């Protein structure tokens, strides 16, 4: 059984780096992370000093573990 958590990563550099930010957080807290699907991308502009790219991903992990 796989379970997915919906995380939005952020980066001041790129959409790829924002996806990595989310995946990094998932790997810090969950075992057996296996893949991530991008579901949305955007850019925060007014409210931050530098534009901040955001990439929302469903990050899937295999259970027999970490729900």
């Amino acid at each position: 059984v796989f379970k997915k958590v919906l995380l939005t990563g952020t980066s001041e550099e790129s959409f790829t780096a924002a996806a990595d930010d989310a995946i990094d957080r998932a790997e810090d807290t969950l075992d057996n992370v296996v893949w991530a699907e991008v579901v949305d991308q955007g850019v925060e502009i007014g409210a931050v000093e530098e534009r901040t790219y955001q990439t929302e991903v469903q990050v899937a992990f295999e259970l027999d573990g970490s729900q």
Copy 2:
């Protein structure tokens, strides 16, 4: 990093009040709730005494916290 939980709030009054019900529950259990996106709305009819409006929301919260 933001994380989202998918909650369906209910209200016997309105769709707005059903969205608030879900957000209220999120704030009872999570720190740093920042926004909610409506993803579905419906009405429970047969099975309840009074029609019950339901609003499903993705409620986003900022981590460095509450996963």
Copy 3:
């Protein structure tokens, strides 16, 4: 078996009241109405005296009855 009819309710007050308008009509003509799913919302402006909120719902009813 459930069957659904696609109805657009109207109200000069709110989207919730427009959903109720459609459900009310379904209950006037069908037995065993069990739930409604919102599929669209809009507002009629030019053509009416007062803005008219509209909510389109799939209204589900249980058969062994009313097709």
Copy 4:
């Protein structure tokens, strides 16, 4: 020919009132506003004092005018 502008209205009261906020702004600046279609709804939470409901609408107006 109709043209649409994509506006997000806000309200501290309800989703219907947030749709009205957007339509009100359209009527302040455009002639012949004829209808609005809801395309998204959400709630701003962290960043405001009171939750702020938002309703995004495509507001249509008839040209021979106001592009």
Copy 5:
């Protein structure tokens, strides 16, 4: 308030049995599971000995409990 978890069940027999696999896991760990909505289906081929059917479901459970 209902909450949903996004689980992908697997089965070497059928899509229905893969949906049951996910629901079974949800019932092992959560109280008040009430329904599941299918959101995707697929088949793992290269990487397994036997084709493995997968069915992804949003499994809903009623809170006053198990978040």
Copy 6:
């Protein structure tokens, strides 16, 4: 001209059998049923003794008949 009715079939066995349940009901009441398109699948859990698989289909029938 074809017309479609939106029916949700149920089965305690499988998604295929739930699609058949809906089609069976359509054939009991309509002439010239020609095809069905699956539009949603789900499982009722809490509220029934046994899980009940549901498959929602648009069932198309040719008119010159049965509207």
Copy 7:
């Protein structure tokens, strides 16, 4: 209250003429037909002598009447 029926019109000439075919059938059997929304278009090839264009429309009619 408006109600919609989902009809697929056919024509050996064009997609517009296939939409008209469906609307024509609706007007033969229902009062107060007010608009139609196109939801799908296709072409039947193998099975007919001449290609047959099909246009599926939700045809809306105002009730106080014809459900």
Copy 8:
């Protein structure tokens, strides 16, 4: 950079002619119109003397110009 305007053209003849109506209006008011994407089609029935076909298009134009 390209920018798009969302226009609904109308025609008493066909969906293609309604798309042309919208594009014609865009070319009357904007420089460098390069393409149009159809996003919706429908037919106005009750409210007009003759059925009026409508085609909604995103019409794209290249800037260094006409925003």
Copy 9:
């Protein structure tokens, strides 16, 4: 087993004629073409002398043949 190829037909006359253009090409190269589903429509403007209507279709053909 049916297989589909995704083709975009073009025409300087209409969307129906652009769908036919794609189907014509499929029939020139494939046996047992059975139907086509429209998936997108658009108009090429800047880059051509005359507007060129385009209709993208999934064209289905029955195998035991032409993959």
Copy 10:
């Protein structure tokens, strides 16, 4: 690099068996088939002696091979 072919399998038994039919055909003609994603399901009724379940899948295969 992976490539996908869009195939509709058929079965007089079930949706799972119809997905297998498509995958079987892909494996007869392509090397390195790795997974399949279900994209549509339906049932052929009028035109066949027995209802025929159909499952449309994108079947993915790894290249360095079989385009």
Copy 11:
């Protein structure tokens, strides 16, 4: 009230840089740009010397200003 403009940015380097191109143009002409949502990505190949990445974004800006 927020308003959105639909812009397609281009870059010969990356999808992130193409999103920035669109946002840059919005900031040159509009006050209070607050965020951008990615809605499509693509690559122009035949017609340019170097592949050109394109990212289409809805760029939102707060009014009390720049419609």
Copy 12:
């Protein structure tokens, strides 16, 4: 007439580079490649040594050629 092939490119560097990987393969085997539309993005994690970014694109090429 344009035809599209659905390819998933991979890269250990970025989503843009994964789109290029797919396009590169298309240009190795097809004449007149004209554009690519991104349809999905994801990241392979468990199963590879280094995260592998994937970008799925519909790559369009003009026929009078390479089907």
